[PDB]
Assembly symmetry: D2
Amino acid sequence: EIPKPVAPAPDILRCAYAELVVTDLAKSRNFYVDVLGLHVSYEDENQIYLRSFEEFIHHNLVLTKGPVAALKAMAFRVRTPEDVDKAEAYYQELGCRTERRKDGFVKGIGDALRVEDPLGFPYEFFFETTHVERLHMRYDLYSAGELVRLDHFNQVTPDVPRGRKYLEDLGFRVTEDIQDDEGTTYAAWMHRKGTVHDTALTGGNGPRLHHVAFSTHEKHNIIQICDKMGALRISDRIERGPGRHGVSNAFYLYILDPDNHRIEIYTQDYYTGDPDNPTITWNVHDNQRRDWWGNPVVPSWYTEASKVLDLDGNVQEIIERTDDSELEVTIGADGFSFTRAGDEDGSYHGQASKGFKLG
Amino acid sequence: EIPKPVAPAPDILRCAYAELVVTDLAKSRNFYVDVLGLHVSYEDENQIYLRSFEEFIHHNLVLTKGPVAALKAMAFRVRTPEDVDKAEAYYQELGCRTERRKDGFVKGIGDALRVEDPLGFPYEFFFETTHVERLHMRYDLYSAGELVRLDHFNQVTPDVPRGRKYLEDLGFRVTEDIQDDEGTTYAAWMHRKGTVHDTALTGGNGPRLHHVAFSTHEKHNIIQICDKMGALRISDRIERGPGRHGVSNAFYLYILDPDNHRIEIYTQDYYTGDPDNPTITWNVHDNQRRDWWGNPVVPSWYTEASKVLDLDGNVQEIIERTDDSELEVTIGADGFSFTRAGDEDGSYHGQASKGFKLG
Amino acid sequence: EIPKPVAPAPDILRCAYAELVVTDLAKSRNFYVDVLGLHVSYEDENQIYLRSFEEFIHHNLVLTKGPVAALKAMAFRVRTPEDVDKAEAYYQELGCRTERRKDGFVKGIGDALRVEDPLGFPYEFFFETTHVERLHMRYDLYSAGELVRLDHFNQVTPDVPRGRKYLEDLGFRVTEDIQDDEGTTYAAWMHRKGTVHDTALTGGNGPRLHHVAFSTHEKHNIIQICDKMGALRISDRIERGPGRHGVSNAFYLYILDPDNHRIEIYTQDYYTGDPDNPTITWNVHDNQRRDWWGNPVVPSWYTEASKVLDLDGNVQEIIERTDDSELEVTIGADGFSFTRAGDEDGSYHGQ
Amino acid sequence: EIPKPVAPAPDILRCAYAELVVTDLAKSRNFYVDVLGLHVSYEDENQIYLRSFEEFIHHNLVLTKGPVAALKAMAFRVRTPEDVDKAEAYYQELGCRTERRKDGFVKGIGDALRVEDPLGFPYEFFFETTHVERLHMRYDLYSAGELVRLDHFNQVTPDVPRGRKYLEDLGFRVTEDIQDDEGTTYAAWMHRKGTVHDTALTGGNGPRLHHVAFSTHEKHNIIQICDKMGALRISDRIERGPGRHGVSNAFYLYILDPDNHRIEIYTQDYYTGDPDNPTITWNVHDNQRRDWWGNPVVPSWYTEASKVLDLDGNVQEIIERTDDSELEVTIGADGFSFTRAGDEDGSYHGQASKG
Ligand SMILES: O=[N+]([O-])c1ccc(O)c(O)c1
Ligand SMILES: O=[N+]([O-])c1ccc(O)c(O)c1
Ligand SMILES: O=[N+]([O-])c1ccc(O)c(O)c1
Ligand SMILES: [Ca+2]
Ligand SMILES: [Cl-]
Ligand SMILES: [Co+2]
Ligand SMILES: [Co+2]
Ligand SMILES: [Co+2]
Ligand SMILES: [Co+2]
């Protein structure tokens, strides 16, 4: 029911940056710069512009001081200047609100288009950006937990197939998904850049931003972030992990910033650039689908997510999911999951894996 | 309570091997050889003799077929032939039942003394052992999850201070422990070889064997064990982890063998060989003491452990712990844990960390 | 001076496989399967088809028994079936010899075009391929040295600018190169898939195949290959490395198969998918350009490379490079390199 | 030739610290703290006291400003205060010069004995030391190249068998050595703490200090040290490696400090604490003995080493080795090495491996 426009989709390269509204800029800076080691491209009393170790565009993360913590924009780089025009025509044909600024919404971005998309998310499309020193060989700066790239976003939306169809028309290709035997979709992952995803849809009340993910080189870099958070006595901000994902096969960690924005650290997924890249569908009851080692998924992972803003900076109203809840069908009192399909040994009924119930 | 003998203690080098009784030898072989990659020194219809990658003594693990799965012996190597005589005299003075076999209890061990120690555990002391090819540079054999050394044992016993004093008199030095502000010791770690430990006491009903631990070279090796267990669809046999320990600072994983004997994989603890090595005491309510990252300790970790045998091969009767339960005081109904001492934020009252409760 | 065809270029996805002729198939199998741990997709008495851990197409490497060890085909996957037609029209316009087999040249590949390209290299273009089990989560099979993807080829050719322009016309984008102040190009790296390269041109006598490269997940996997080669007492087959590259920033190792085909093991280069990806030019005298740690490049790495075959299976005649030699200008008797530009300390002259 | 004293040997725990005389304290600080990330226990205008990540004794390295760069002391910790007395009586009986100071020679060490040992090296034995914060869990400080422990020293000495017998009587156990088929010993490694070594003897003109070695947790930490040195454009201070050793099986790297004092970064050797630990002897012509991957050993690694000082602070005179030279027999003009014993293929005649 989101129609395919007659207008051609913009050619999207990759996820490029997020703008997050934060309430205390100094506390946020401590987290992203001092704890996580991201590199400052620009900062003032109002905003902090941050990039990963291997980035050459101006930034991967913009922290903007504001009254209500929320996602303000998730930005995708398009292939040419003309693709911004294509994005504008595309979303206008969808009847979405758009705003076009020839000199950008944030520093280091040129001609850019922001839109309130059909799922209620603030997307940005841009080509022009200020190139900065690519720090990829600055091993004099390299931290034991170095974040090397922006990898993806993850969005919470009530109707996954509706959103997926819309993203496929935009050019994103589905790589993996989670479904049940009676036709409910719980989550889908989709890419432009040849990794498992650039964005992903997680079934839930929405629009909300589930997380932004950065990559490391190696698994030990993710271990170090955990170790460093323990040393800083902020282990309570480690939400979930570390682990190996089923979907994507990446090694992962989820942590929470000072405003509870969720950040994933992620490494070593696989190549998806071929157009007949085999899709993988997982059963929602498979306890190795999210954590391959069977570790239980914390309920906050399923329930909590950041607000998103519309183009005036007001919070988007949330619409409730009516399809089945992943939490409820897997780890709730009526849930279940299995280690081996069909085997009662290693299956969990009315609780999570490993001997825990919901707190 | 356990008196210091007048007889000199044996000079103990290190933990050397454990003999575990298993119910199905083939299934147990599949676990230790095919899944974990231990190296077969000898086997027959009744026993499998296994060693780690860097070992030169005959074995680190003996699997013995029997009717009831149990620990049959935890074995420590002593410095000289004469230390076996010292051991016999020492335990005889302690009023303990002992058995001496000039040609060993298991193949590849010579003159050996087994004892029913004052905590009810079957200890063996030996010097003589058949040397085998040390595989430390056999990289043609090296597995992605290679177990390189035997590291320690961990024993469940109801009265930790009683056992701790006895082990200190035997020459083990306590490196770390867990206590509360009311005089209760929950656990202690003690060594001879200059690592955090060779054995350890965990407060609980006993005597029972909590685990046997093997080490890997690096953290990624432990990750690979998890990943392989996922691939073999036996993730339900991963009990707890992987993680970073608070006590010991080691990276760790706990898995369960076919008879539910617990095995820990462990790496990168610190040097303790100096006689005034600083002893570290953690508070039992510190939520970073067991898992540095704050991840909850599954209840089975506190409640489940292996039976131990007496010298006749009969199961030792279990004596109930009357001191406070670590489980109860941290994750139980009236339990409490903190992330930062004296901060309510990041504390847990009557449940586990990260959003979980006891199943 | 290779003219751009008016015919549209095929849309190339990536490097996909190489077909190497080997003289002793069993010896070759020992190296690629037992030492290196590649996964068998098919074998018989004449060929072995091998793939890396994360591959879903039929193979990344075909070993074919033949009388003379050589590269028989370096194969690139194209985006659609129609791109094979585009490739045929493109190379035909270039005046190249071509051969189309609607049922493929090797097993597991369908409609395929092979060509003797303008640099004398046997290129293949195909879309159709038999999908196989993607082993990316088969950690029960995973080796301590596991090879997880095919990453790139490297080609020895006498005139780098000439080849570079030809590959740019084909849609490859240069990511890094090596030049001097006099204006000589010694090497160039170029990509389609968004890594530092899918192929690369090394200045030298050619056409010859310098190496085929596979990636690992982590640096320790490369270390393990070395360690295993020591344990197998074949450390003499370790040619160069392990190291960190300057160009590409990748951790690397070069080893030699039983017919002296050079295999690179490679990991952790960077993303190049943006069309304005900044191009990095290194000076040929910078001693950190090839090995970032300043370790010397053994002369064999510059002088040795594999023969390539024409479409009849005969060895391609070789053309001598007339441009300056990177070996000669860096480690030859009149060569030099520096650690810090302009500093005699940490410089090497004739050495 | 060096007699075994009647007096009991001291019970030596491990190598504990080295005192290095350096010429420019600021440059040495930049290397050891800024490049390598060692932790400052104490510093003033004359000395920098440094320790590794997991250490609790006051320091593993003392950098002392002086006119001539050299080893001033290689220190071993002993098990009890009474073992310093035992050390003293032992070295007096050996006829060695000794000097004992109840309040130590450097800050952070108490009662200490220093000796000019029978091979001409300045050994210190102590028990008493000031405990400091053990940083083993301070992951807020942890560097990508973090040095976690002091592992060993390596000493250059002309007659290895002579030295080996002496260290053995002192309680060190030989774990590995290098010999040839003609009765010559080229190197030996020996331990107290249950690793491959606490010190080692390399055949060569001496006494000289070959290197001091620090451990990392993992192989990637050593790789990061190389990468950082490249980024700082000081790759010319990487001498050798990184590699896998044959002897010891450890992953390694050799780098040079501003006074050319050689530092090794080392990780993942094996447990040697059993008294019948099997000794491993390598042939000197085995090209996998030093670098398991057969990478060539640069001649500077065999020829260059640091001066050592006597108890008065003067440089020890160097005695020339007359036994065969490892450099000459493996990579010199008449040198030879093999990959596979008895196989001509993969052997090197009169030159180093790998072209
Ligand atoms: O398996 N899932 O839990 C996944 C897989 C990949 C992701 O990036 C993620 O956020 C969740
Ligand atoms: O730095 N060069 O020596 C390089 C860089 C990347 C490569 O894949 C290579 O084969 C050589
Ligand atoms: O094998 N050798 O070259 C070795 C082995 C261990 C060492 O610590 C060393 O400095 C050299
Ligand atoms: Ca209390
Ligand atoms: Cl624990
Ligand atoms: Co994600
Ligand atoms: Co343990
Ligand atoms: Co290459
Ligand atoms: Co050394």
